[PDB]
Write a protein that binds this ligand. Sequence first.
Ligand SMILES: [Ca+2]
Lengths: 7, 325
Amino acid sequence: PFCXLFX
Amino acid sequence: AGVGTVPMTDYGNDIEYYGQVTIGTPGKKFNLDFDTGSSDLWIASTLCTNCGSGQTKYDPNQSSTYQADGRTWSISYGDGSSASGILAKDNVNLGGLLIKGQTIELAKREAASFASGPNDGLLGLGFDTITTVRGVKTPMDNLISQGLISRPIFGVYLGKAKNGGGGEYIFGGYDSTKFKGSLTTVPIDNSRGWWGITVDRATVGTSTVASSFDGILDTGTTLLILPNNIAASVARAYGASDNGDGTYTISCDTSAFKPLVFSINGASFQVSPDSLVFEEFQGQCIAGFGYGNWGFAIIGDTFLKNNYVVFNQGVPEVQIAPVAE
Ligand SMILES: [Ca+2]
């Protein structure tokens, strides 16, 4: 899974 | 494809979605992750010393429109990944829209997770208040000021791998073949530089698993990440077990599950039973919802692959409708 700035 | 239309590729089991962007003159095609949770446009480059052999790398020497810049940049994402390098200027072609003189960020270093993923970099679609370098106009800002879009919007369709994958972003318009019924307008709070909305409540069957909570619409996040208490309440409704790492183990058989319904601005939006299962590994299934220690939810792909969204940077606001399927 990805989690791109704040999270 | 129509003007401003970008077909997307669904990577794996709805892990992420990337589209082709042409950068430079004459230009090279790059696969970028379309991310509403960030606002930097960065790409792997030939200056990079720990980049993936598989990534397409921007080469300043091969673009007659490259313009050097003396600033550096560094980014660190919520999930611990990062990248850093120098700024530059060049032309970017987004679905036929040629943005002239866009600030691009060339990577010199990137996290291994990027080196081993499927994209060449990221296209940030968040607000300009969170660009890592002050004064950088984002691609949406330039589409608007260069008159490339006449409405400050982008329509987003993310497909489901189970139905063939795909997805489509339309800059400056939207496609009603992708959703059913009327769009619901939802005001956006961009005070933190994100597409923040308020969810009125969440129910599973007749049970109210959550009251109002804030969340951010993030195309760059795979799951539905909820604050601890809310995630725990949701998990109880489905008999999911906490893996102790921000994820849950759920039954691979979703035939018996009721949908997770969000009430937003008076309308119902759901996470269909099939979306409650993210991935299956050696007969154990990882749920489509996870937890994090924030007071707000990250409304990721689990939710967006079930609901079409028109993002309006102008108001700002969003228009949402259940996907046509
Ligand atoms: Ca991500």
